[PDB]
């Protein structure tokens, strides 16, 4: 699914996920968030299962963005964990965790959780 | 916190997280899980905030492992999202999401969630 | 939103959530899962914000089902945490945690997480 | 585990969870948070497995608090999902989701996730 994953994806919020899937299982690219303390593109990196099951299962993957670029630093990082589902209407279905750097006293409220669905076509 | 994050970390389960923090915000290394459908080391890659706040907050970071190596393939990927807290008892406090590749019918039960705490000394 | 929340709701899997919202903030009712080690209805209880903000924000709520009834016991419990959004196409948007009883050795894989969206029409 | 669960529990933050476990699987009681937009006690309700496995497994349970009482209203609700592990040093190990009421535009940042461990003795 190197070819299937590589490309430009869009989530339900209007964020843009630009990714290349390497033959070795690497994910590289850029993320631009339509929401939050974010401007322009941020580096991402991750991994995917480069030899998925041949039984109709999805392809497991995940990636991270730290929310620092040349424009802004939100002192936070999001990880997306999910699976790629191929076909006519290909999708990456994810859940995510966004951790902010906090003091120890505020660490209980450090992490947001959500879910993003990416498609090859904008909404 | 490049020097502080770079090195060998151990979680509460006895897993080993070997990481290098790059000047550019990259995380690269290997993970060895003490539990689950896993043997030996797996590639990891992620990101950290390379210019964190100077107010005593932690340093946000995250990384991904896809559970495929030369020995085994669990058709799954884990992402850790958390923060590095420096000092005498340095720690990385994380929450994680483990997504397995599934059929669409089983996608509701695709993703496990948990929390791991890493220290520079083994338990 | 007592009136708005009380009733029968359906999620994207075809599960059925039957709830009464009490004036005091209680949620009581039954849940029937279309998936998993489940059959028929299970008791639920939870809570909701009975005096929500007047600024167009949703209404926070949550509830629990332990997956034991007279038919089956899956030795697990799910909690839904979310908000009610009123209007012509009312919805309850949730994220959930399903914890199974495990040995200590297996506790790292005890808990599934997911998200369910409920509407008043199937 | 009716007897084992019923009573007063304390988490790592100093919060107090006062619960009665009913023969029918009900959980009832009060919660007092040591942190956040909270003062005094809040109603809780939930459920537990009243016929757990006899194989050394924990006892699944969960409960909800809506953060409204006579003193304050944080327009939010937390659910704890976890298991009771009996014995000397009995514990309830949980993960939680805190959802705030939000506008639709802010719904992506509505929900915090974390983990709390409760014991029968205070920290």
Curated annotation (Swiss-Prot), chains A, B, D:
Domain Avidin-like: 2-123
Residues that coordinate or bind biotin: 31, 42, 80, 96, 108
A GO molecular function held by the record: biotin binding
UniProt keyword terms in alphabetical order: Biotin, Secreted, Signal
Motif (Cell attachment site): 47-49
Subcellular location, record wording: Secreted
Record's keyword annotation contains Oxidoreductase: no
A GO CC annotation given for this chain: extracellular region
Major subcellular location class: secreted
Subunit relationships: Homotetramer.
Function description: The biological function of streptavidin is not known. Forms a strong non-covalent specific complex with biotin (one molecule of biotin per subunit of streptavidin).
Family recorded in the similarity comment: Belongs to the avidin/streptavidin family.
Name of the protein in its database record: Streptavidin
Organism: Streptomyces avidinii
């Amino acid at each position: 699914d190197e070819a299937g994953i590589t490309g430009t994806w869009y989530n339900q919020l209007g964020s843009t996920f630009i990714v290349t899937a390497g033959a070795d299982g690497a994910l590289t690219g850029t993320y631009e968030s339509a929401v939050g303390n974010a401007e322009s593109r941020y580096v991402l990196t991750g991994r995917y299962d480069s030899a998925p099951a041949t039984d109709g299962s999805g392809t497991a993957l995940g990636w991270t963005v730290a929310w620092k670029n040349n424009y802004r630093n939100a002192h936070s990082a999001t990880t997306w964990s999910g699976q790629y589902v191929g076909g006519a209407e290909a999708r990456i279905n994810t859940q995510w965790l966004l951790t902010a750097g906090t003091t120890e006293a505020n660490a209980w409220k450090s992490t947001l959780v959500g879910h993003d669905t990416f498609t090859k076509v904008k909404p």
